[PDB]
Amino acid sequence: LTHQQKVLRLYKRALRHLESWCIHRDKYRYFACLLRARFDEHKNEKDMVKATQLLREAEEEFWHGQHPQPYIFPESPGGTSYERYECYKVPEWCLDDWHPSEKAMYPDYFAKREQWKKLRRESWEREVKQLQEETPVGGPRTEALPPARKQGDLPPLWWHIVTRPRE
């Protein structure tokens, strides 16, 4: 994480644990600027050790004053009924084993599927081999050229592009 944005991850959560402490909707709102005052007290000064005491002593006075059972935003990294619905989870590619007379239904939809595959049937010869041209040796984060220079098909097809919905 670049030294510049390191306060954000605190600046995101700072007021976050606040609101679960306050009760009235104004209480959060009334202390906004008042506790907002402390940030820009020294607004423009050194990036290094001079202002690192804005990072250094931020540790205490935060962890101190922490865990009033925060509001968890139910569907999220934690807290109730977040990951709740798995009874569907949309197992994409359920379309393999059928024994038709189970395939009579959704004929228009079976027509559409086999039309998607043609892209993934052969998109490769320039899709894969360009990744042999694109990343010279040890390349970091691995996405292709954002267009793939003419038509990406998908290119990330279809696992990320067709992936499973929520209901």
Partner 1 sequence: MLKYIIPTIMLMPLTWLSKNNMIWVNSTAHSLLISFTSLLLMNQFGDNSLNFSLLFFSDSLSTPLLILTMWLLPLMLMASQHHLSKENLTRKKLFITMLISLQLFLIMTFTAMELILFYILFEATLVPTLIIITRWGNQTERLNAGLYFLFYTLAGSLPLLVALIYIQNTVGSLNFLMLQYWVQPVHNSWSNVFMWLACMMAFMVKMPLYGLHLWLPKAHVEAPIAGSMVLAAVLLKLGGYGMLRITLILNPMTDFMAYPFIMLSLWGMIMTSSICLRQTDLKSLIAYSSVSHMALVIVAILIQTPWSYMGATALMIAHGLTSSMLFCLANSNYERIHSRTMILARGLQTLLPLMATWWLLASLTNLALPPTINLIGELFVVMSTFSWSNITIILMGVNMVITALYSLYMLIMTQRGKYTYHINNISPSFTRENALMSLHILPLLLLTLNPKIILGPL
Partner 2 sequence: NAWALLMTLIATSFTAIYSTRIIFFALLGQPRFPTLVNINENNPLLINSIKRLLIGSLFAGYIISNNIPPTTIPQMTMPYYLKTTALIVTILGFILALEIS
Partner 3 sequence: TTLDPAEYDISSETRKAQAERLAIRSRLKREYQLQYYDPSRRGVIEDPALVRWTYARSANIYPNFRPNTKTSLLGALFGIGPLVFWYYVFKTDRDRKEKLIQEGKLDRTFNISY
Under the binding rule (CB under 8 A), the answer on residue 141 touching partner 3 is: yes
Is residue 38 within 8 A of residue 57, CB to CB? The reply is no
Query: Which among 6-14, 66-74, 85-93, 101-109 is the span making contact with partner 1, rule CB under 8 A?
Result: 85-93
Q: Which of these segments, 23-31, 73-81, 97-105, 153-161, binds partner 3 (CB under 8 A)?
A: 153-161
Q: How far apart are CA 83 and CA 160, in angstroms?
A: 19
Per partner kind, with CB cut-offs from 5 to 8 A, the member of partner 1, partner 2, partner 3, none near residue 40 is none
Supply the DSSP symbol for 4: G
**126 scored as a contact of partner 3 (CB under 8 A):** no
Selected from 35, 128, 145, 162, the binder of partner 3 by CB under 8 A is 128
User: Is the Cβ of residue 25 or residue 121 nearer to partner 2 in the bound state?
Assistant: 25
130 touches 148 (CB < 8 A): yes
* 36 contacts: CB under 8 Å, gap ≥ 6: none
For the chain, report the end-to-end CA distance as a whole number of angstroms.
35
Nearer to partner 1, 100 or 146 (CB): 100
Judged by CB under 8 A, does residue 93 bind partner 1?
yes
Distance CA 143, CA 155 (A): 10
Binding mask 52-81 for partner 3 (x = CB under 8 A): x------x----------------------
CA–CA distance, 138 with 159 (Å, rounded to integer): 24
Q: For residues 104 and 110, what is the distance between their CA atoms, to the nearest angstrom?
A: 9
Q: Kindly report the backbone phi and psi dihedral angles of residue 30, in degrees, each rounded to the nearest multiple of 5, phi listed first.
A: -70, -35
Q: Please report, as ranges, the residues that interact with partner 3 according to CB under 8 A.
A: 3, 52, 59, 120-121, 124, 128, 131, 135, 138-142, 156-157, 159
Q: Given the rule CB under 8 A, which residues bind partner 1?
A: 86, 89, 91-93, 96-97, 164
